[PDB]
Structure formats: C-alpha cells, structure tokens
Write a protein that binds this ligand. Structure first.
Ligand SMILES: Cc1ncc(COP(=O)(O)O)c(CN[C@@H](CO)C(=O)O)c1O
Ligand SMILES: Cc1ncc(COP(=O)(O)O)c(CN[C@@H](CO)C(=O)O)c1O
Ligand SMILES: O=P(O)(O)OC[C@@H](O)CO
Ligand SMILES: O=P(O)(O)OC[C@@H](O)CO
Ligand code: NA
Ligand code: NA
Lengths: 262, 389, 389, 262
C-alpha cells in the first residue's frame, strides 16, 4: 500500500515518470533470477512487477509463456516464489513490488490465505489478470484487510461506470492498457477522466520496448510505463552468456528509465 | 447482466476486463434473439430443412437380449455433420450475424465442432479460424480434411498436452485481440457466462424431442437418460427438459481414461476440486499448487480437465449422478453396437453406452426403461479403433 | 412369372438355368411381401425409426446467386449409412429372412452398398460376404474398415479392372454355388428380373417424399429432377413417382470419365450398344467382337459399363434424357457445394450436381425450379479428392 | 445335328459310354491348341466341347478363366476361332464338335448370323451358357433353321415342366449337371424321367477328373461324361514343356476314355 504513495510523491516531486520492469519469478533458474532482479534495481527500476509461473497463461503471448516453461523446468513453485520474494525484500526495503497473478493460484489455498502470505512477505500490490471488476469483491475485500493494494486494469474500451468502479476500488496505481491482445513486445480522455474520478496513477502497460514510448506515455499523462516481454527477450536471447545477459539487461533498463524525464 | 451467471457457487465471468463488454453484448443479443419471432423462425427452418431434424429415437433390438431392460438411442449421429454439435452452432452463427460480426474463431478436440463451425460459416457466409491440438489433429484427421475442404483454417496447437485445453487457450488469446470483427463460437456449455446458458438453450430440442417421442412409443417417461460429459453440451441438451420430472434420473459419464487410479483420466466433476480457469468456477483437475492438469481419454471429445458449471450444480444438490467408463469399456461398447445393431457410434458416445450396458447386465432381472443420447457417428474414429489390434 | 421382366426390349433373365427357380422364389416372395400388411408395417418402422426418414429437402441459398434458378437438394446423404443405398437393403434383408435364408452375398464399388449390407445383416442377424474390387478397396477404404468393424467379410477381387464389374462376376459365381442358404443382395436396379422391379419399389419413397415436399414449399411440381446413373437405383427411386406427370422432366447423369472421346468413361446408355451380360439385355460398352469393356470414372459408384433396363426404356421412348459429366466437372461441383453450402457430397452425386450448375449458369435468366438427389456424403471420398493437389 | 445321332448309334451299338473333352480354342496359342485337339482325338475323344474365349466367364471357375486369358494374350478372337474350327473339321469330318458359348458373343453379330457361321464351318451344336430355357426361343429357332442342335442344361434342381421343356427343345444331347457351382475340377430319377420324356442322351457335366466318375456316370445311366478343367490343368501345368504336355494329355484322355466301358 504505502511504498507506492511514497514513490509517486517522490517522483512527482523530482518531476519524472515511473519505470516498472517485469520478470517471471524463477526464470531462468532461481539463482540468476535474483541477480537479474538486483541488476534491474541497480540500473534504474522504480518499482517491480513480478510473475508467479502459471500453467495456463490466458493473457500472455509467447515470450512470457516460454519464460514460464523455463521457470517450471528450473523447478520453481509458488512456495519458491514467496521464499525468494522475502529475500529480495530483505535487501531492497524501499521498492514497491507488485505481483501479477492468475486467479487459480490466488484461489487455490483460500483467497484470504493468499493475501496474508503476500503481506507476510513484503508485497505491495496484487494484480489478478483474470478477475474482472464485477467479480473482484472476494479478492478486493481480502487484500484491503491485509493492506495490499488491489490493482485493476483500465481497458481502451472502458466506459463511464467502469472508470468510476476502477477509481473506487483500485489503489496503488491504475493499470492502463495500451492495446487489445495478450502481452507481446509488438506494435488521453481516459487519463483525464481517471484523474477526474481520482483514480490512482495511471501506469501504461502492454507492448513498450522503445524508450520513446516511455517518454510518449509520460508526456501523454501516464505516470510511467510498464515493460515486460521486451526484458524477458534479453533473458531468452542471452541464456548462454549470463555475464553478457546481466550486462545487456542493465543497459536496457537505464536507457528505458532515462526516457522517463517528463 | 440480464441473466444469472451462477449455478449455485459455479459459473461466473472470470475473464480479462477487455472481453467483458463483448460477453455483455452477446447476452443482450441472446435475450433479443430469443424473443425475436423472426429469429426463432429461421433457427427452426435451418434445424428442420438443413440439419435434418427431428432426429429419431431407435429401440435396440439385440443388445438387451435376456434382460428386462428396454434401451432406446437418440440418434444425434443422424444430424447433418455427424454430431449433436450442429444444433448450437446454427443458433450461434445466426447470433454472430445479428451482431454484424464476420469472422468466427472456434476450438476443436474431436474435430466435430470445427467441422460444424466450418459448415455453418460456409452456409451463412462468415470467415472461420479453428484451433486444434496437434495430437487430436493426428488421432482425429478425417475431421481435419473435412474442415479444410469447406474452406476453414485449422491451426495446430502444439503447446501443453496439444489437446482441447491448449486449443481453448489459443482461441481465447486470439479473441481478446479480435473481438471487434470476430465472434468466438465456443465448443460446449463451459467457459464464461452467457455461454453456459446459450449452448443449453440451443441444445434443449434434443430432450424436448425425446420426451415427446418416448411418450408416444411407451406412454410413460424413461427411467433414466444417460449421456457422456466432456464439457457438458449434449448432456445438458438431453437433461434440460427432464429436470422438473423428478421420476426421471439423469446420469452423466466422464472419461475414466486408463482408470481413475492411474491419474490418467478426464473426470473433473467427481475426481477434481473447484478451480478458476477458462472464465469459470467449476470442478477441475489440478496439482496441489493450483497448476491446471493435463487430462487423458482415448476419445478426443472428452479429453478435457474441467466440466461446465450447471453439471457441477445438478450434481451438488443431488439431481443428476455422474459415473466414469474406462477406455476399454468404451471400446467394448463400440464393438458391440457395430456388430449387433449396425450403428458405428463415436468413441465419445460409447462411454455413455458402456454405462447403460453395465446397468443392464449387472441387474438383468430389473425392469428398466433407459434412453442413451447417441451423440455422434464413429466415422472420425474408425482408423484409430482399428490400430488397436 | 407374375410380373413382366421387360421394359420394352430391355430386361430379361439371362442366367444359368440353375439360378432360375431362385429368381422365381424371390419374385413370389416379393409379391407376397408387398401385399403383406405386416411386412409393410415393419419395413416402415425401420425406415422411419432406424434409418431416419423422411429425409429433408434443402433449398440452396448461395450457389444459385444471380440466376433465376431455385435449386432444392434431396438429402439422402442424411440417411443412416450415408447414402440412398440403405432404403432398399432393409426391404431386401427382410425378404431374405421371410424366405428362411441366412447368408447374404453382396458386391460393392463405392463401399456404400457393402456398408449398408453389413449394417442390415448385423441388425437382422444374417451372416454377410461382400466382393469388392481391389482398386475400389484402395480409393474407397473408409468404407472398407466400416464393413469389417460391423463383422462383414469383404473379399478383394483382383481380376479384370478390379472394379464393380469384377465384383458382380464373383458375386454371381458364388451365389450359383450357394443359393440355398444365401440370398444375393444386388447393388442396383440392374441384373436379372425381379431385381430391376424390387430395387425400384424399395426406393420409390425418395420421389414420393420429394413430390409431397416441393408441393408444400412451392405449391407446384419441379421443372426437372436430376440424379446420377451408374446402375440406376437412386435415379429410378427419384424418377418413379414423377413418370406420369409429363410436365416434370427427368435427367440422368452418367460418368464422362476422362471425356467420352478418350474411351475412358462409363456412359453405356448414351455411348454403348445393347448387349447381354449380368442377367440382362441392356446398353453396354463393348468391343466390336462383343467382349465387355472396362469402364472408368473418378468415382467408384459410377464406374460400371452397363445401365439397368428401365433407364434404357425411358430413354428410348423419350421420357427421360441422359447427359454426362467429366471427372473435372464433378470435382468442381464438389468444391463448390462444400465451400458455399457446407455439405460435402459424394463424388457420385457431384456428377448430378455439376449438370444442374451447367443448366443454371448457361442460361442465367431462365426461370427454372430444379431438384438434385443428393444421394450420399463425401466422407469416403475426402482422402482421394485431397490428393488431387 | 446328325454326327451326334451317328455317334450315339455306333456307341450304343458297341456298348460303351461317350467321352467328350473340353478345351478353350486358342489356349495356349493357336498352333499348340490345334495340336492338342488332334492329340485329344488321337487318344480317345468321342466328340468335342470347345470354348470361344469370353471376357467375363460368368459360369467358370479359375482354370478356365486363366485359359481364356492365355488365349486372349495369344491374340485369339471369335474370327480366329471360326477359322481354326474349319481347319480341324477339314481333317476330322466324323467327330461331333459342339461350341460352348456366352450369349453376348452369339448376340453380337445378330443371333441368326451366328448360327449361319457355325453351319458354314461344320459345327454340330451350340450350348449358350447363360440363356435359360425360358429365354431360348430366338436362339433355338435360329439354330434349328441352320441345322445346329440346340443343347440345354438339365440342373440337379429341375422340375416336371422343365424336364418336359428341355426334352422338347433340346437336340444332340441333354447336358446333365453334376452339381451346383461353376466349372471346377473339384468335388438317377432325372435320367429316368428324361428318357421317359424322350430327351436326347444325357451327358454328365461339371467336375469329372477321375476315370471312376466316368464309369460311375455311364453305370448310372449317363450316355457319357464331359471333362473340362481337368484337361486344361495339364495345359497350364506343362506350358513350359510342350512335348511333355501333349504326352501327358494323351495319357489322360485314353485312361478317361478306357473308363467308358458300360
Ligand atoms: C460426438 C461427440 N459427442 C460428445 C462430445 C463431448 O462434448 P460435450 O460434453 O460437450 O457434450 C464431443 C466433443 N466435441 C468437441 C470437443 O472436443 C469438438 O470440438 O469436436 C463429440 O465430438
Ligand atoms: C452415394 C452413391 N450414389 C450413387 C451410386 C450409384 O448407383 P446408382 O446408379 O445405383 O443409383 C453409388 C453406388 N453404389 C454402389 C455401387 O458401386 C456400392 O456398392 O457402393 C453411391 O455410392
Ligand atoms: O506487453 P508486455 O510485453 O510489456 O508485458 C506485460 C506484463 O509486464 C505484465 O503486466
Ligand atoms: O466342370 P469341368 O471342370 O469338367 O468343366 C465344364 C466345361 O467342360 C464345360 O462344359
Ligand atoms: Na471434462
Ligand atoms: Na453404368
């Protein structure tokens, strides 16, 4: 809950947009995943979007799908995800970490029991990819009772009552979609209305891979950009030279974050 | 929403936010269509004059010999296309057109919904893409060639088990991206509301015709109606008009695969736990961690690790009973229908049949009037059943 | 004999003396059965409740676009088994049983009469042997596996062209030897009397239903009924109730094979001369010396160098007209029915269809109500039509 | 017509049964066919049954079917059959020769035109294998006008009126069947009744290969036995050593004919 308010106040303060990386927890093995996450923070990461690997990624394109399979082959479970989440909170206590989830993994152990384990480990927000606003009530009441921000998606085709509901129930940031589709590295009235309704900071989402999209987003009114596949593609690409991987990752993040001045 | 999305705790709309207005468009379209007399009229004309309906209710002459069981079959195998599948798809293509849509995405496991999706798109003029798992493409290939000759595109999903789950997934992934132009013609009474209600309503003629037919032949209603259950459409099409006649039991048959005890089966409703996937809250087969499990069946149209929600509800309140049948028991009922009645059934429908034989031969002196929904023909299956030698 | 064996000069009983009492037994059996109300009643019950009849009469929505032609199809493809074949075989198996017989010999070319002979033998409990030419066994194999799974025996005739002529021959050779126990279930309205009359009478429901149906939909009788002609059964089943309504023309379509002019075709009635073979005097394809000729067609159910006698007679007095269609023209009408109407027709029925399209597109402003007998489905054909790429 | 009366009078005379071989005209080539026919007459043949090769042998088993194909490969037509029939009548003017035919070959050139060519060449009888008694009228009126004996088959399942019709219309000999089936080399009230009706000499037909069947037949009341496949099988067997063929044929015929004393 608060680490976001913190970040958005200090960012508004030094007048810049936010830069939030995405990585799947455990790809391409736990040991190198933790180092990728430290190098991402090192190079420029304002907050973190993290994935817990699901079997059936309903809203994900192929880079993330293969990432999930690399994780699964490395033997990563939901429990290894929570135990590595506490080790990186143990050394980076400022950074907002948000979890991007699928509903079966939240629901599995008891919904409320999920939120409690998040709280316990140091997690700030939970985005459940497949629970629409009209189904959120069990999930949003249980994250509020455990002081985890409920993140909701605002789609390009959103209407009056939906922007109102997302503004009321959301916290942390409003996940603002770029396009229709599933997560892939390829190809204003809403931001205005969201602010009119007092919806928390619009971070823009699918398909940013280019720095000029970041600048563009911030310039448009988006409090930052989220980039996912773009980053995972460098993990995939450099799986054979870990050194060069961490090195190319660094470079990518600092450039991407540099683009956030506006 | 104008209609309820829950069958007790089961159901819902567990989709990405972006598809919700689309589901909402469809429910409105459905409610409008159902009252539109002009919709009803041409749904009817194409069911009768094009699909070939009423389907017949056949009495079994030879398989019940030396038993007090009378066994009628409902012949959805005599339906244009070769399966029950065709009744729903005609209503839904008509809904797609009423809503100015022009592409059709669909997913297929036995190939029968794919083929039925290609035949209605060619008739009503809609372009059509179909996802089908790479293992089902091999073990069900007659249905592949049939789709491509009608001009549909089938796309081979190699991910996961390369089976219907994996086709459902790629099908929903594309519709999120295409929902403007494209309708998603869902395979069964499963997934997101309004699809559980639409597929049932567009398949209840099956049981409205059986009830009428049996009453004319027997002057009384059956003792039990039996149907196999992969996602749930033929079963609910059959059960639906019978639900308020408490005297009529309703049995549903799930794939026992290599035997429940091996892990290799497809029996969610009776050997899985409630989960959330493919837009619903329904019994599911999953690991301890909530990762969805790969199922197994000898039959591609039944190889699916969840079950549609209304079945989950009718089980729970105790109005329908669900049972399973092994691969081997379904092969035995196939071989027996062929050789003593001269009807090749689909390996899917053989699971329902094999239970009715088990009911008969376990208590041979029990006087019982049964009805099995023979949902399709075994033409897609003859090459496969014949390499089991 | 109690009935006439000649349709003008065509017909007769050109058999070995030893089979004559057998043909005489059958004609008596037939006359008895036709007046037996108890025979009529259960022929009916199995046609309705087991075969699935009345078959539908479908209006074509898309292929007639921008033409004044209305085109209905008669859907014998929706008949249990997948072809018109099944109506005759049920009456004849019942005749076999009425006469205390217990084996059934039959011959098959497209495999559809073989399959229908196996399904009725399994239903009514008769043992069954089927001769089928080795080339048709390959190019029509879906129908082979279907026969063996129903417990019938199919025997591969390699002699001659290894096609229906060669199967007819081995089938008559065995029946001469077995006529005591075995009935010979002849494929078409061809061969020795009484078979030309029995096959027609056991197939005239096809046209009695079309006449009724068109009159209900259009309030008037067709301008023409079209049907393809290999031996003659579907055509005469269709033509029979229409013959005294002089306003209704009747067209019959023979295989043009690679083109009449190549020699490679199967068009006896219009490009052969009267001969005597297979128990009849009918037009035939033969050398100058009277040696019977091998025919050709892309379709196994039409690959046959003679034609049944009543067709030979209706041609001669000018009450029916006969035309041909090339391989290529039948492939074109297959591809077009699939893609614009979502019905895969048999390559046999495509020859009839391809003529109706030719009639339509040659004179597009001619106002004409046509009816094509869609006699079977194209399921046996999909592997073959798809290696023509 | 008469050569039969002749044979049956001289055979009745010297009290013995008749022995009639069968061969397909032209198998295995014209030249060797004519020599087989001379050796058959040489070794003991009382009369001759000859086949003109048809494409579709409706009443024939495999030995004869393959014989037909050997003939066809040797290039034998109906015209080469008639021209070789006159060359063997030109050197054996006593022997009754009967032609065993299929109806399409009779019917082809005009039925009456067929009978005339037979007469012209020196043929005594024509057996049409596929025209039953009730269809014979065109064929039996045209052979009578050209003094060729109409031969009819009497089947094991023959009744009152049939034995009467066969007795009335037949001439030459009555072809008396041994069994049901088609011609193959494997496995009294009628003879009495035929004689009561005054039907010409019953020669017994399908499936004689053993001398004791000949003796048996004659003893039973049959004026002789016809043997076909049995002989063709030696043509087939010895196609490679023509010498040994003619030699084994000879032996076979004399033995078979020896068996005719009764
Ligand atoms: C003849 C027959 N009967 C029944 C079913 C099972 O589905 P149901 O549970 O929906 O009724 C199938 C499956 N049909 C689907 C799913 O694999 C298809 O895409 O082909 C079938 O092919
Ligand atoms: C669908 C269909 N329609 C028509 C015909 C042609 O025969 P018909 O001339 O007798 O009507 C066939 C042939 N049916 C026969 C002969 O080859 C069989 O044994 O399979 C057919 O398969
Ligand atoms: O569309 P991408 O490729 O930037 O990836 C989306 C994910 O970060 C998750 O929100
Ligand atoms: O049965 P077969 O074998 O003696 O041959 C019959 C032929 O001679 C012709 O009459
Ligand atoms: Na299932
Ligand atoms: Na023909």
């Amino acid at each position: 809950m608060e680490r976001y308010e913190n970040l958005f106040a200090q960012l508004n303060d030094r007048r810049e947009g936010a830069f939030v990386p995405f990585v799947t927890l455990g790809d391409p093995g736990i040991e190198q995943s933790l180092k990728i996450i430290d190098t991402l923070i090192d190079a420029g990461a304002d907050a973190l979007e993290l994935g817990v690997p699901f079997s059936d990624p309903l809203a994900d394109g192929p880079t993330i799908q293969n990432a999930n399979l690399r994780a699964f082959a490395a033997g990563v479970t939901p429990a290894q995800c929570f135990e590595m989440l506490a080790l990186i909170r143990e050394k980076h206590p400022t950074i907002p970490i948000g979890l991007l989830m699928y509903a079966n993994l939240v629901f599995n152990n008891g919904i409320d029991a999920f939120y409690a384990r998040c709280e316990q480990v140091g997690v700030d927000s939970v985005l459940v990819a497949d629970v629409p606003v009209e189904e959120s009530a069990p999930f949003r009441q249980a994250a509020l009772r455990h002081n985890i921000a409920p993140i909701f998606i605002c789609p390009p085709n959103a209407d009056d009552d939906l922007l109102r509901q997302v503004a009321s129930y959301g916290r942390g940031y409003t996940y603002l979609l770029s396009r229709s589709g599933v997560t892939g590295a390829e190809n204003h009235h809403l931001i205005e209305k969201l602010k009119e309704y007092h919806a928390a900071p619009a971070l823009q989402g699918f398909g940013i891979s280019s720095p000029e999209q970041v600048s563009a987003a911030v310039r448009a009114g988006a409090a930052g950009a989220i980039s996912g596949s773009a980053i995972v593609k460098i993990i995939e690409k450099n799986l054979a030279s870990p050194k060069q991987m961490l090195a190319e990752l660094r470079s990518f993040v600092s450039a991407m974050k540099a683009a956030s001045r506006a | 929403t104008l209609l309820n999305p829950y069958f007790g705790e089961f159901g819902g709309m567990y989709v990405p936010q972006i598809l919700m207005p689309a589901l909402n468009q469809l429910e409105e379209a459905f409610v409008r269509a159902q009252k539109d007399p002009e919709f009803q009229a041409q749904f009817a004309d194409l069911l009768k004059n094009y699909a070939g309906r009423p389907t017949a209710l056949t009495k079994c002459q030879n398989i019940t010999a030396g038993t007090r069981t009378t066994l009628y079959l409902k012949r959805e195998d005599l339906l244009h296309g070769g399966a029950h599948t065709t009744n729903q798809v005609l209503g839904q293509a008509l809904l797609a057109k009423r809503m100015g849509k022009s592409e059709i995405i669909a997913e297929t496991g036995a190939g029968q919904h794919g083929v039925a999706s290609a035949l209605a798109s060619a008739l009503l003029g809609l372009k059509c893409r179909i996802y089908m798992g790479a293992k089902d493409v091999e073990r069900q290939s007659p249905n592949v060639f049939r789709m491509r000759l009608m001009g549909a595109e089938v796309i081979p999903v190699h991910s996961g088990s390369a089976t219907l789950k994996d086709a459902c997934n790629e099908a929903l992934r594309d519709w999120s991206g295409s929902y403007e132009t494209a309708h998603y013609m869902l395979g069964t009474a499963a997934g997101p509301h309004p699809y559980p209600t639409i597929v049932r309503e567009f398949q209840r003629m099956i049981g409205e015709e059986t009830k009428a037919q049996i009453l004319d032949k027997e002057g009384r209603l059956p003792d039990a109606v039996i149907a196999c259950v992969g996602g749930g459409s033929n079963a609910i099409g059959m059960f639906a008009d019978f639900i308020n006649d408490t005297s009529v039991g309703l049995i549903g048959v799930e794939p026992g695969g290599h035997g429940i005890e091996t892990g290799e089966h497809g029996a969610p409703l009776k050997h899985g736990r409630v989960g959330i996937y493919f837009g619903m809250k329904a019994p599911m087969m999953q690991t301890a961690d909530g990762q969805i499990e790969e199922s197994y069946s000898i039959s591609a149209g039944l190889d699916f690790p969840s079950v549609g929600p209304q079945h989950a509800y009718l089980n729970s309140i105790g109005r329908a009973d669900y049972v399973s049948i092994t691969d081997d028991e379904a092969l035995e009922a196939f071989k027996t229908l062929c050789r003593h009645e001269g009807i090749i059934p689909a390996l899917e429908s053989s699971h329902a049949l094999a239970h009715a034989l088990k009911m008969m031969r376990e208590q041979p002196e029990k006087e019982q009037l049964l009805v099995v929904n023979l949902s399709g023909r075994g033409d897609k299956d003859i090459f496969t059943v014949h390499d089991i030698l």
